[PDB]
Design an enzyme around this catalytic site. Structure first.
Site, PDB file in Angstrom:
ATOM      1  CB  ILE A 165      -5.632  -8.820 -44.480  1.00 14.09           C
ATOM      2  CG1 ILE A 165      -4.484  -8.770 -45.541  1.00 14.09           C
ATOM      3  CG2 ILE A 165      -6.317 -10.145 -44.914  1.00 14.09           C
ATOM      4  CD1 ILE A 165      -3.232  -8.335 -45.002  1.00 14.09           C
ATOM      5  CG  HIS A 182      -6.577 -15.321 -43.943  1.00 17.41           C
ATOM      6  ND1 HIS A 182      -5.999 -14.499 -43.010  1.00 17.41           N
ATOM      7  CD2 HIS A 182      -6.852 -16.471 -43.289  1.00 17.41           C
ATOM      8  CE1 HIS A 182      -5.931 -15.110 -41.851  1.00 17.41           C
ATOM      9  NE2 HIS A 182      -6.422 -16.319 -41.994  1.00 17.41           N
ATOM     10  CG  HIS A 191      -6.065 -12.361 -55.369  1.00 22.93           C
ATOM     11  ND1 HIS A 191      -5.123 -11.886 -54.470  1.00 22.93           N
ATOM     12  CD2 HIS A 191      -7.154 -12.702 -54.658  1.00 22.93           C
ATOM     13  CE1 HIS A 191      -5.643 -11.983 -53.250  1.00 22.93           C
ATOM     14  NE2 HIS A 191      -6.859 -12.531 -53.348  1.00 22.93           N
ATOM     15  N   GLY A 239      -7.172 -26.749 -44.403  1.00 24.22           N
ATOM     16  CA  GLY A 239      -7.348 -26.726 -45.850  1.00 24.22           C
ATOM     17  C   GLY A 239      -8.784 -26.262 -46.134  1.00 24.22           C
ATOM     18  CG  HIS A 258     -12.219 -12.376 -52.589  1.00 24.60           C
ATOM     19  ND1 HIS A 258     -11.794 -11.857 -53.792  1.00 24.60           N
ATOM     20  CD2 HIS A 258     -11.100 -12.659 -51.878  1.00 24.60           C
ATOM     21  CE1 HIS A 258     -10.477 -11.761 -53.782  1.00 24.60           C
ATOM     22  NE2 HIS A 258     -10.034 -12.243 -52.648  1.00 24.60           N
ATOM     23  CD  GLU A 259     -11.123 -14.157 -48.293  1.00 21.79           C
ATOM     24  OE1 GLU A 259     -10.138 -14.965 -48.134  1.00 21.79           O
ATOM     25  OE2 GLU A 259     -10.907 -13.008 -48.689  1.00 21.79           O
ATOM     26  CG  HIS A 312      -8.641 -17.057 -51.852  1.00 21.54           C
ATOM     27  ND1 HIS A 312      -7.967 -16.934 -53.050  1.00 21.54           N
ATOM     28  CD2 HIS A 312      -8.736 -15.807 -51.338  1.00 21.54           C
ATOM     29  CE1 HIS A 312      -7.636 -15.668 -53.226  1.00 21.54           C
ATOM     30  NE2 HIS A 312      -8.118 -14.957 -52.219  1.00 21.54           N
ATOM     31  N   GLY A 330      -5.889  -6.229 -37.247  1.00 22.81           N
ATOM     32  CA  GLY A 330      -6.949  -5.313 -36.828  1.00 22.81           C
ATOM     33  C   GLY A 330      -7.810  -4.648 -37.874  1.00 22.81           C
TER      34      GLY A 330
END
Ligand SMILES: [Ca+2]
Ligand SMILES: [Ca+2]
Ligand SMILES: [Ca+2]
Ligand SMILES: [Zn+2]
Ligand SMILES: [Zn+2]
Length: 165
Positions: A77, A80, A125, A89, A115-116, A119, A73
């Site tokens: 976080i 991601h 990080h 993937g 940022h995502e 990843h 919620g």
């Protein structure tokens, strides 16, 4: 040992579904600019597709959303992504229980997308608070935002650098 990298430099993306917090055009612009930040310092080339299925699927979802990692919620976080691989993937998910914006209130979509996508491409990080991969969200203006040396060094240890000409 390092995580997996993309083994191709042409990578596609598709926006699954749009948050209602922002104009659709601003969603498209922010994700786009965010791929562009990483295109700028590697050989990688990204292209949007609207039909078919892509390497990186961008999604807005709240709560449990069908993977191994439920959102928690509002707050907590914010989002991601998963490192390079087939299927889930490379995908990036943004928690709809945030309020995504183009500014310094709520949560700024462009800077979280950068940022995502980091990843998505295989980065973890950073311990450097100046890096966009530092795990804490801070607002900075979009015109002024730059990747740190640390971010740059990490992406390019993965895909090398550009590349002219
Ligand atoms: Ca994928
Ligand atoms: Ca959350
Ligand atoms: Ca929202
Ligand atoms: Zn997810
Ligand atoms: Zn992260």
């Amino acid at each position: 040992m390092m995580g997996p990298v993309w083994r191709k430099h042409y990578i596609t993306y598709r926006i699954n579904n749009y948050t209602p917090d922002m104009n659709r055009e601003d969603v498209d612009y922010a994700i786009r600019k965010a791929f562009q930040v990483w295109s700028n310092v590697t050989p990688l080339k990204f292209s949007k597709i609207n039909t078919g299925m892509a390497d990186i699927l961008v999604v807005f979802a709240r709560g449990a959303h069908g993977d191994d990692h439920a959102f928690d919620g509002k707050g907590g976080i914010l989002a991601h992504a998963f490192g390079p691989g087939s299927g889930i993937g490379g995908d990036a998910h943004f928690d709809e229980d945030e309020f995504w914006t183009t500014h310094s209130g709520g949560t700024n979509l462009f800077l979280t997308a950068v940022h995502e996508i980091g990843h998505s491409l295989g980065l973890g990080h950073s311990s450097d608070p100046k890096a966009v991969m530092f795990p804490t969200y801070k607002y900075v203006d979009i015109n002024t935002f730059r990747l740190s040396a640390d971010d740059i060094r990490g992406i390019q240890s993965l895909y090398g650098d550009p590349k002219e000409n």
